[PDB]
Each structure stands twice: as structure tokens, then as C-alpha cells.
Amino acid sequence: GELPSILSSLEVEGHSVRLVLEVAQHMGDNTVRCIAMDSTDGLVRGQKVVDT
Amino acid sequence: PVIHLGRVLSVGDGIARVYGLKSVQAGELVCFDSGVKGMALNLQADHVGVVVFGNDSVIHQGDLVYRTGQIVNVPIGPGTLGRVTDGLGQPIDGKGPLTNVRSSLVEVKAPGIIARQSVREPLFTGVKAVDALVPIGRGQRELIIGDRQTGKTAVAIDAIIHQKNCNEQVPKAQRVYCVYVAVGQKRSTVAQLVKLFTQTGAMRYTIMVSATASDAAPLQFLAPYSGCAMAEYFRDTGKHGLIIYDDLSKQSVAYRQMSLLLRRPPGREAFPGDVFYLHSRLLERAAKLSKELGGGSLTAFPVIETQAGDVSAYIATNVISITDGQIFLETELFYKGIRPALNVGLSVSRVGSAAQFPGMKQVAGTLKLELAQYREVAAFAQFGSDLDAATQYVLERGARLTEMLKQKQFAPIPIERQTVAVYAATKGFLDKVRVQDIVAAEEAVISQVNPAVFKILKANGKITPALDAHLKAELRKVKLPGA
Amino acid sequence: ADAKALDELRKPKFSSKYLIQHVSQKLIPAVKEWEKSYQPPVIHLGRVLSVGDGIARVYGLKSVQAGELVCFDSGVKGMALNLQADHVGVVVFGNDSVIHQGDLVYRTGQIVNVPIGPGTLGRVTDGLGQPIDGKGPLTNVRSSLVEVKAPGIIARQSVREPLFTGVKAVDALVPIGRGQRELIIGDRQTGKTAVAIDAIIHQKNCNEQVPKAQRVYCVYVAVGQKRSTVAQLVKLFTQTGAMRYTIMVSATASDAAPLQFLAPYSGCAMAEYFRDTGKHGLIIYDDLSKQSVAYRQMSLLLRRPPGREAFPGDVFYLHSRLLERAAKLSKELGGGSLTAFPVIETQAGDVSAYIATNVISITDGQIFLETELFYKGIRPALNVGLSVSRVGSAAQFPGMKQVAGTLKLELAQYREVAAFAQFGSDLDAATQYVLERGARLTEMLKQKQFAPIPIERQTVAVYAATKGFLDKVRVQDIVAAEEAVISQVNPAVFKILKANGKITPALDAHLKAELRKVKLPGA
Numbered sequence A: 001g002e003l004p005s006i007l008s009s010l011e012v013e014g015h016s017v018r019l020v021l022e023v024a025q026h027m028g029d030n031t032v033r034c035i036a037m038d039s040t041d042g043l044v045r046g047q048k049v050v051d052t
Numbered sequence B: 001p002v003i004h005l006g007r008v009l010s011v012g013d014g015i016a017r018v019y020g021l022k023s024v025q026a027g028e029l030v031c032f033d034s035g036v037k038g039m040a041l042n043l044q045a046d047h048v049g050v051v052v053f054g055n056d057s058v059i060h061q062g063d064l065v066y067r068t069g070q071i072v073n074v075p076i077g078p079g080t081l082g083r084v085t086d087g088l089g090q091p092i093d094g095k096g097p098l099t100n101v102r103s104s105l106v107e108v109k110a111p112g113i114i115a116r117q118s119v120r121e122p123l124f125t126g127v128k129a130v131d132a133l134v135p136i137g138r139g140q141r142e143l144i145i146g147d148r149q150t151g152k153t154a155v156a157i158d159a160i161i162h163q164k165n166c167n168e169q170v171p172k173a174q175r176v177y178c179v180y181v182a183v184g185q186k187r188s189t190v191a192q193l194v195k196l197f198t199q200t201g202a203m204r205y206t207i208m209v210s211a212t213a214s215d216a217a218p219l220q221f222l223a224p225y226s227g228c229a230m231a232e233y234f235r236d237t238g239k240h241g242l243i244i245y246d247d248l249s250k251q252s253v254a255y256r257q258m259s260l261l262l263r264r265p266p267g268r269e270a271f272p273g274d275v276f277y278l279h280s281r282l283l284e285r286a287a288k289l290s291k292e293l294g295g296g297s298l299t300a301f302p303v304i305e306t307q308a309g310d311v312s313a314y315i316a317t318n319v320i321s322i323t324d325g326q327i328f329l330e331t332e333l334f335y336k337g338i339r340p341a342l343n344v345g346l347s348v349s350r351v352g353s354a355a356q357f358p359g360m361k362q363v364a365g366t367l368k369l370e371l372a373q374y375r376e377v378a379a380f381a382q383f384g385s386d387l388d389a390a391t392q393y394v395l396e397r398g399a400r401l402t403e404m405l406k407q408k409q410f411a412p413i414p415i416e417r418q419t420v421a422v423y424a425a426t427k428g429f430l431d432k433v434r435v436q437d438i439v440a441a442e443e444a445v446i447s448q449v450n451p452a453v454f455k456i457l458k459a460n461g462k463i464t465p466a467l468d469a470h471l472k473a474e475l476r477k478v479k480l481p482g483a
Numbered sequence C: 001a002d003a004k005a006l007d008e009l010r011k012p013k014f015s016s017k018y019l020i021q022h023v024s025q026k027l028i029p030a031v032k033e034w035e036k037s038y039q040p041p042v043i044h045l046g047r048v049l050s051v052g053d054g055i056a057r058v059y060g061l062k063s064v065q066a067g068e069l070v071c072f073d074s075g076v077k078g079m080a081l082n083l084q085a086d087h088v089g090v091v092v093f094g095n096d097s098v099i100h101q102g103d104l105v106y107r108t109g110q111i112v113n114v115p116i117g118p119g120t121l122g123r124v125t126d127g128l129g130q131p132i133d134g135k136g137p138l139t140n141v142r143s144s145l146v147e148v149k150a151p152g153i154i155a156r157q158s159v160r161e162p163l164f165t166g167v168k169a170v171d172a173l174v175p176i177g178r179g180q181r182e183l184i185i186g187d188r189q190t191g192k193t194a195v196a197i198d199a200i201i202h203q204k205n206c207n208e209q210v211p212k213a214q215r216v217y218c219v220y221v222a223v224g225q226k227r228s229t230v231a232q233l234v235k236l237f238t239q240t241g242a243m244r245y246t247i248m249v250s251a252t253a254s255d256a257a258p259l260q261f262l263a264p265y266s267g268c269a270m271a272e273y274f275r276d277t278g279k280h281g282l283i284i285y286d287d288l289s290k291q292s293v294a295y296r297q298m299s300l301l302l303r304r305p306p307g308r309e310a311f312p313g314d315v316f317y318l319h320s321r322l323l324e325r326a327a328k329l330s331k332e333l334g335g336g337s338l339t340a341f342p343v344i345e346t347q348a349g350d351v352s353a354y355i356a357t358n359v360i361s362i363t364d365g366q367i368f369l370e371t372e373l374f375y376k377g378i379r380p381a382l383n384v385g386l387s388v389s390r391v392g393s394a395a396q397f398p399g400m401k402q403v404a405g406t407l408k409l410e411l412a413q414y415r416e417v418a419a420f421a422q423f424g425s426d427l428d429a430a431t432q433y434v435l436e437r438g439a440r441l442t443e444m445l446k447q448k449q450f451a452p453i454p455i456e457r458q459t460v461a462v463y464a465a466t467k468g469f470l471d472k473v474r475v476q477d478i479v480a481a482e483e484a485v486i487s488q489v490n491p492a493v494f495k496i497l498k499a500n501g502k503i504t505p506a507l508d509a510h511l512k513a514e515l516r517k518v519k520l521p522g523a
Ligand SMILES: Nc1ncnc2c1ncn2[C@@H]1O[C@H](COP(=O)(O)OP(=O)(O)OP(=O)(O)O)[C@@H](O)[C@H]1O
Pocket: B147, B148, B149, B150, B151, B152, B153, B154, B155, B305, B339, B340, B407, B408, B409
């Protein structure tokens, strides 16, 4: 609930480095589509992402 | 440990769709029940897109996929030296498992701004066309670019063979450990090349990471990164590494295959949009580290095969904008017998003159200047119109420097026997020797000059005023052929 | 969602029945009360699911074969091309405007047939075999498949008998054997049809002079042409008499694109009747580059994956399985033959285009027809430097082979020095003789439309130019000097050149003597 705005930055919890996502699209089923500012190798499909 | 399973949904076009594997990481090495490895590439909402490091024929729908728990890794360490591995670090030479080794990631971020330092110490290739004109420092990326059969590997091979000869005469703290990454080549020519490195003794320091033309395209895509992780072991522990990715032209074609089979939209020459980042991610890992990171270094020699001298191709210009220098090997000079067929007008070394032999730095300055005029004169005196008898002087002088930079294959020269031979030809001592005799004539120069001149020049690193007084004397006393 | 959780739902898990026992007692009244709001469910029939651009997706048709003729309830025929898991994608032989969503499709149980036999000879059929000349149905005929597999390696023999086109540029330089595939390639308006017409007309002039087994029965397939163009060809073949031996399969431009795709295969099945019965056939696929556009249209509308120039992946397989049916059968299969002449129209000579590249690979040589040679007066505009006949090394008339080998060299030396010495000012005494002989040889080979020459009469006109006898007429009279030689020479040398087949040395001496008492119009 309460999706972030487009261009807003998100933070991935528990990554090897600080992984900052940036919201690019609102995909449509409470999904945003983000671009990562670092590598996504080591990302799991349950990882909690907090909105800044 | 609890084993996480996953069924294969559908396999084919080199990629399996895998149901399950809910906690798999992006980029994780997965293992199929046929033994074949795979990389978890696309984590989707309902499946995992796995690229298969090998033949997709052994995978069926309903096969079990196990996760290994870690991102794609290869074994790195001193137990890899001497060994011929495939694109995943598994040995194919039949000499048992890699003992004395430790697994590390193949996809590592290259060191940043604050982790590098300037490239200062030279790396000698043993090729006097290279080591005098296009000098290569430790931590540099030097593109060997040319057409088909222009001596691209010959330059990479003599660099590796020369590092064995230099490693016997130096302390352990400055010893270059080579890696040859063979991508998309014939398993025949890798077997000729392992024999060549074995009978020379160069395989004591060389790793051979081979992904041949019969291997799967994700294995050819990965072997530059598998080879670079093996050579980053020496970069990170304070030692020095050389790497040759022979045909990065063939890595990108293997990567273009994976992109078009993943139904990704193609760009210039049907290449993916991230085919720049393919080689950019790889060649930035060849760095010269700072003193706080150890001072280690990795020198890359990417090889790119052009088509008809077209250096303005897509992958060719991608790597020219990645690498520091460029060794352009020409096909017209190659069929005229000039081998190594260096395009002196185009071959450059960005870092270059800051990291060459100070003897060669003060000899080959007037070598690349006089070869510039010989290129300038014989671009305008093609017609045989008229002669100034000074332009015909530099036509006869530039023809002597060209034969002076010819070199045979699998016989690298030390840098002290190189800079004396360029001193012998630029200082007029090889005047009036016929241009069909200078191959024999500086074989006479290097053999008849006292060996102490090469030892004084090797240790001082520079032609001292006491030495060029003595070296001019010892070149006066030389039985040149024909007189 | 997965399968292991969804395969366990075939077992009953309900364990309570306040719905299953109620509505089973209440389903059949609600369904029956909209019986007239229902259509009967089709299993072995088909119902048109969607239709448009000549493609009908058809629900049902459980037992159709791939490539089978289906029939709609409008009477329009179809062809089940891609059978998918949910529907059949059929191509419509005609207008889909009479095909509606919900129409019934009936399979005929027949892979596509055409009437082949002796009764189809002389008639003008459409691309499916039905006669469009307006003289009743085909009688004395029988049905046969259009997708016959071509004969193998072991049912063929070597192509040795010459098939005469009647064109001097063709019969001397690029000679055609009896079971050969020769491409007639070139741009538009360069005389590709006129080469193929003259090969048909010349067969009629030869069919009355040969003993009934050397007779050639022609088939002209007109794909994607005008109906007025085929009306001219029928008038030209009737006023000559060539449509005693000619079939015309005509799928014109307003015809459905499955009919233009199918017309080369329908004409080849009519032509294979003569090959299989020991006679000899000759087939001209005029605009094979218009069949491939018709097959591209059906493929892109059937959502097949496109290749280069949006052609399907099996467009090489389209033309190769058509053109390999042109064979020369062995003597145990009757010894009959079928020789093809596909016609490819290039665009500004670009023979590196995709369909032109495919058919050049299939056929046994091209006849090139440049449009710069066409307006230079050379008609037929056969470019000698690019037109090949890779069977023609001893596959021609032996009397012409006496002199065409020298013509192949003496024109070849002319082609290097033609564009050299465009001027005639300052010339060597050796290269100018090549430029005078090579210009004598060019003018001799050109000829007028709809007048094919017998092979014994173009042999002596090349012999009149390969030898001396014509090194004095300028360039402007060799058209008249050749027909002078045809008129003035005693025509009993033609009776013993044609019957023997070669220039015997007795006839060679009379040939020099007869070519000296001629009155050449150089004056
Ligand atoms: N300096 C040299 N002197 C003489 N011959 C040489 C020299 N360098 C290379 N050659 C020879 O030139 C040929 C081609 O060289 P090389 O194998 O390095 O080509 P390449 O660029 O790797 O071509 P390929 O596309 O086949 O891999 C070989 O026969 C090799 O032995």
C-alpha cells in the first residue's frame, strides 16, 4: 500500500553494498519498476525495500 | 544443509525456465541434475531464467535444479597456474582437480578512482616493434587489433613467453603471472598453444582459460570474466598479472547470441545495447592498484579481429574507447613480410612513454620520428617522380629501421638487447649495410658486442655517458656483413 | 500455477455436496432454454473463428491434414496450412468477404489436386486447374497432387539432349539441355517473357518435324500478371498454333494470394504428366518473384516468423521443392524430361536480393538480360558475361558446338576491350581487329521478336561470322547480311546439317562455297 512516486529513491535491505533503486514506472498491480544504482547480483525475490 | 529444489519449466535456445527456487539470488550459480551448471539470470515473478553453462540437450522439462547458494564463482589461487581450465574454472587438462585454490566471484566491480595509481613500471613484451614504439606499462589495457592472420596472437604469445624469461632474473615481488583466455577458437589451436607454453616453460606462470567454438555461448561469454578473476588474484595480493582475452570479437558474438535468444531488442549490427558494458565491465578490472591496496597490477591485452581493416566497426570502436592504447596490426605490411606488422602511424600507447625503459626512451624517440618521415616520404614518393637525395636518404634510412623492427616468432628479446639494436641502427652504425642483411646484421651486433654492455644497461636502466662512450666503441668493432 | 499442485485436482476433494447435487438437477433447464441461442458444437467440422485478409482461423477440424483442401459453406475452397493447438489457420482460395465469423468449414479429405493429362493440353486454366478459357470443363483428364516429391538421384540421368529455344543468343552461348532449370533473370521490360515465348513458339515449329517422342509440350505459368496480358498470350499462341502443345496456368493479380502461390505447383503437376509418361515437358514460371511475394503475404498474415525482406524461413524450400521437379528421368522411368524456366525480375540489376539469390542457387544457370544492352540495340539483351549455363559443356547441338566455342572466346576478348576503346581514334592493329570482329559478332546474335530460328539455320549464321564471309559488312548491315545468307544459300545444306547434327567435312567445303556466291547487302 502507498506506492512511491516515480523518480523517488528506494533502499534495499540487507545487500552487500548500499543498493539504491529509483522508481521508473508504476507497473500496475501495486508494482513499481525501478532502476538500480548499483549491481543487482545477490538480490532475492523477497527482499524488503524501504521507501525514502 | 537444506537443499532448495526447482523444476525446469521449459528448456531450449540455450536458456531454461525454472519453476521454483524462491530464494535464489540474481546471478547465482545453479546446478542441474545432469551436472551441468547454470546462472540464475532473470528472476521473474513465476520462474527463473537460467542460462546454461553447457549443452542444453541434457536438460528436460521437469528436471531438478539445485541452488549452490553463491554468485557465479571460479577457483582462484596459485593452484590455477599450469592448468588448462574451461570457462568455469574446471580443469580440462586431465591433471586432476584444482587443489590449493579458493573460489571467488567472476563478476567483481573494478577498483575505483581512489584505488588506482599511475602506471609507472614497464611491462616488456619482447617484441621490439612494440617495446620501442608502443610501450606498455603494468596496469594498462592494450588493444591488439587487426584483420584475420596478421600476427594478433603472435604479439600476445611472445609477451607471455617473455615473462617467463624475465621471471627467472627478477625478484619474486615483480613477477608477471600470465593468463591466456581463449574464446571462440578451435580446440586444435589451443592444444598447439598449450604445447608451446609447456615446451618453452611458460606454462609455469600461465593459466589457460579455454572456451572453444564448440562450447556454449554462455561459456564463451563467461570465460573472459573467469580468466579475469583468476588474474585478479595476483592483482589483489600485490603481485603482477598479464591477461590476454584473445578475440573479444568472439565474446561479443557469443553474447549477441544470448541476447537474441533472450528476445532482447538489438542495435548496431544486431548487437545488444549493453555490448559496450560487456567489455567495459571486464577491461576496467585491469588496474594498477595503490600502495594501500598492495601495489599489484593487471595488464590486459584484448584482441579484436577486424574485417577489411575496418577499425570503425561497432565492437572495434567500443574497445578503442575502453582501452588505453592500441596495437594495430596491418594486413598489407603482413603480406610484405614485415612481421610484426605494426601500423606505426596508428598504433599508440596512451600511458606509454611514462612507463618505458629509460634506455629505450632516449633511443626510440628518434626511431619513431625517422619512421614518421619514411611513412611521410613513401606516401608521396610512391610514383617515383623525383629525388632530393635527402628524401632518398630517409628512404634508405627508414628501410633500415623497418628491417630493424622485424622479429621472428616465439623468440622474444630482452629489453637491453633490444635498445642496443635500436641504438645500433639510429646512430648510423648500420648505415651502408644492405636492407636484405639487417636481420643478419644485428644478429651480429648483439652477438659480437661484449655481454657486459647489456648487463650495465640492464642494471642502470639507462645509457649513462660512460656507457654510450663505451657502446659506440663496441659498435665500431663489429663485423657487419658485406662491409 | 504449477503442475504438481494442479494434477491433484483430478481427484475429487469436495467432501460436501450442496452445489453438485443441486445444479446438476438445474443445469439442463437453463441450458435448453437458450437452445436457439446456441450453435451446434463442431468436432470434425470447423467453425470460422475469425477471418480477414484471406486468412480464416477455424475452430474445430479435428482430423484435417496439413495442406488439405477444406471447403467453407460459401463454396469457397481453403487450404489448412498451419494446424495449431486451438484452431486451424486456413488460406482462402478466393474472397473472404463471403466468409463470416461462425461459418461452417468442411474438410474435403483431399490434399490439393489438379487435373493433369492429355485433355488439359490447349486449355487455359486458373491457378488451381479450373478452366478460365470458357470452353467447358476439362475432359480426358485425371487428378493429381500439386506437392509431388521430386525424383531422386537414382531416377535421373545426365542432361544430354539439347532443348532449342530458337534464340541465337541462347542456343549458342547459354545452351539449354532437356531436363535443365535455367533462370531468365533481369530487370523489368528487358525481354524476359519474349525469350520464354520464343522457346514455346519454337517447340511448335519443331513438334511437326520430330518423331512423336522428341515432342516438347509447353506449360506457361503466369503468376501475378494482368488478365489482359494473358489474353494477349492466348491470342499469340492461338494465332501461331502453339496452343496445341501449350497449357496456360493463370493466377493473375486480382486472384487470391494462395492461388498465386499455388499456381507454379499446379502447372508443374500438369507438366509432370509429360515427364512421367516418356514425353518431354517445358515449363515457364513467369514471375517466380511474384509467387514469393504471394507466399510472403500468406506467411505474414498467418503470423509466421519473418526473415530478411520479411520472407518466411521456408522461402528457399518453396522454390527448391518446385524447381527440383524439373528433371531428366532415367531410361527405366521412361526417359522423359521436364525443363524449367523460372523468371526472376530484379530491381536495378541487384541479383544479391533475397529471392534472386535463392533461385540462382537452385537453377543450373541464368540468362541475364541487362537494360543497357536492351537500349543499345541488342535485343534479346543477353548479357554474355553474366549469363551461365552450367550444363552446356557438351549439352548442345554438335554443329553449333563446332562454332559456338570460338564465338565464346571471340566475344570474350571483345568484352574487355569494348569499354576500353570506346574511342576509335588511336588504335593498335591487334585490338582493333577484336573490336571489329566482336562488333560483327554482336550484331549477328540479335534477332527480332516472335521469330525463333531453327538450329540448323543459326548454326550457319554463326559459321558465317565465326569464319570469314562477314568481315566486310560494316555493323549496320549484318542484320541484313545474315538474312542474306539465310535467303541465298542452297537450303539443302540445312537438310543435312540438321539430320547429321554436325558440320561434316564434305558439308564444310560446300559451306564455304555456298557462302561465297551470296550477295551481301554491303554495297
Ligand atoms: N613475427 C612473425 N614472423 C613470422 N611469421 C609470423 C610472425 N607472427 C605471426 N606469424 C605467422 O603468421 C601467421 C598468422 O599469425 P597468427 O596465428 O598470430 O594470426 P591471427 O591474427 O591469430 O589469425 P587467426 O584469425 O587465424 O587467429 C602464422 O602462420 C604465424 O606463424
